């Protein structure tokens, strides 16, 4: 019974696993954030078979469904009611996300206003 | 080492030049100090010409 987007095409992801950094499973000091390996002998860098995979532009997402949420919208962070009224005329393609640091008192006004304007809110039930 | 065409330069930085760098951050203060002394001198010698 939620607000629906103008269209809801099929979202295709060329990949869903994250790219884990080389050897980030072997040490705690190596975080999983990706880093382009650059060792001379690095077998990940040389693209040996069965090794960790490197990101490259080929994995890029379709321009038509890029950044699109599972609901079919695209999010836009808002901090108050005034910021919410920009989405008045793109309410069938962009939803509202209320910033984490907005007090519970101010959320009710935003969540109420968005209901009047038919703007979708991704986190309407938070800090209640 | 020289690289292709260029000028042959002989910078005079073979001494301890950093020990004797005269900065000029007191320049505005100097200008105020000299101006304050010109006005105080003109008052002292008035009505004689300030220039001298």
């Amino acid at each position: 019974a939620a607000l629906r987007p103008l269209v809801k095409p099929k979202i295709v992801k060329k990949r869903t696993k994250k790219f884990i950094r080389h050897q980030s499973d072997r040490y705690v000091k190596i975080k999983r954030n990706w880093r382009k390996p650059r060792g001379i002998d690095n077998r990940v860098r040389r693209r040996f078979k069965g090794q960790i995979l490197m990101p490259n532009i080929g994995y890029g997402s379709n321009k038509k469904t890029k950044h699109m949420l599972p609901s079919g919208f695209r999010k836009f962070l808002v901090h108050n009611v005034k910021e919410l009224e920009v989405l008045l005329m793109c309410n069938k393609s962009y939803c509202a996300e209320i910033a984490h640091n907005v007090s519970s008192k101010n959320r009710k006004a935003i969540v109420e206003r968005a209901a009047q304007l038919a703007i979708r809110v991704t986190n309407p039930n938070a800090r209640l | 080492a020289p690289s292709r065409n260029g000028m042959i330069l002989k910078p005079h930085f073979h001494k301890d030049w950093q020990r004797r760098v005269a900065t000029w951050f007191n320049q505005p203060a100097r200008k105020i100090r000299r101006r304050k002394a010109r006005q105080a001198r003109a008052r002292r010698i008035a009505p004689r010409p300030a220039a001298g």
Partner: protein, 147 residues
Amino acid sequence: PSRLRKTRKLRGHVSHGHGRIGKHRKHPGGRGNAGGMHHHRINFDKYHPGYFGKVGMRHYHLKRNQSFCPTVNLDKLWTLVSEQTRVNAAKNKTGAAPIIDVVRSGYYKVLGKGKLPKQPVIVKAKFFSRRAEEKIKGVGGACVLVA
């Protein structure tokens, strides 16, 4: 600003852009202009011919004021005076020629590059070049020497 420079783009690249084989070492080849007559000879002879050796006489206690002699060509002579000086003399019937005093404009020698407008003029100067004197005379002018 350091945010627009290579150092920000060489982060995470071993060798910081100086190579893995040759590396960045302190002073390979010598400091400054060392090697001119030696392992750096080709550079000096290719781009700095004449660099080595001595030519000509020495002059102790040179005083560059004594040789002060700014020069002006004839193509710029009429700019030393006002515009209304040249037009008034161009259109006058008595034939009176204006005086152009180059020394007043800060020049000592008059040189002959260019051509003069067909107009008499009296030129004062410490020095003149031969072709300058002929060109000033060609338009009915006169050369006057000052000290």
